[model samples]
Target chain A: MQIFVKTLTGRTITLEVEPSDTIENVKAKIQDKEGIPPDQQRLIFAGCQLEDGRTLSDYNIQRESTLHLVLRLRGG
Target chain B: MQIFVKTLTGKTITLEVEPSDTIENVKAKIQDKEGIPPDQQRLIFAGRQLEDGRTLSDYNIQKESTLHLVLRLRGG
Candidate 1:
């Protein structure tokens, strides 16, 4: 199914994905495109956070669903 | 934007990508997940084949566009 992932910069990425895909697989793809560390990135949908151990199907994500991307907070 | 790429196995892989992304970049991401060689894959949007030298914008790809993938024939 198709899904959209967007960044705060208003830039969105179109992905070819399946529900069998894990949350980590999605983030790794983000890292490949944007150079953002997976650990430093967070995935959210419907106001809930996605977990690494979970698959898209586990979250009940639907086709054309848009997932939010938030850069994980860090302190120096 | 969202897109879907389906394999004969009925499996799909999702990626995060920008319009500025090159065709090769997308393939590289696919390689990481499916362990397939980038060069061995071909991306086609509509009837036009995606070129490694071009970006998604160059192809005028729109949101939720599905890019078809065909494995390059290999001779042993």
Candidate 2:
């Protein structure tokens, strides 16, 4: 599945992935391409945060799905 | 299982739930208690978003687990 990621700074990128790709793996790729640390990125799809241990298919993330990448802030 | 939820506004709430409880069910409870719509709440645990369709046990959400609740912002 190919997923569209929109960052907080208005940067858009497309990632090619398998349905079996874990959210962590996707985050790694995003980190590689976007220079954003995986720990700092909060990926949201369908109004839900994407879990690292779960696969994209587990959350029903299909081709062309859009994800929002928000930055995590420190502290409460 | 009992979990702690911290809202964006610095509010903390504790919820008791079964391991079989889905994220959607938890969100519904939050809606009832906090007045935040389900669609507007992003429940994040262990650096990942909890998918509504999956059970808390699926993500290994245990007693004393802390979930950060953030509000969803519209647009890119």
Predicted candidate 1 versus true structure: per-residue lDDT over A1-76, tens digit per residue: 7899866444678787899999999999889988999989988875578999899999888799878787787761
Per-model chain B TM-scores are 0.79, 0.90
Best by TM-score: 2
- What is the Å distance of residue A53 in model 2 from its true position? 0.7
- Note the DockQ of each predicted structure: 0.02, 0.04
What TM-score does each prediction get for chain A alone? 0.88, 0.89
Q: Return the TM-score for each candidate structure.
A: 0.47, 0.49
lDDT, candidate 1, at B48: 81
Candidate 2 local lDDT, A1-76, one digit each (tens): 6789876455679999999999999999998987888888888875577788999899888989878888876661
Candidate 2 on B1-76: residue-level lDDT in tens? Answer: 6888986644578888899999999999888888889888888988888887999999998999889986566677
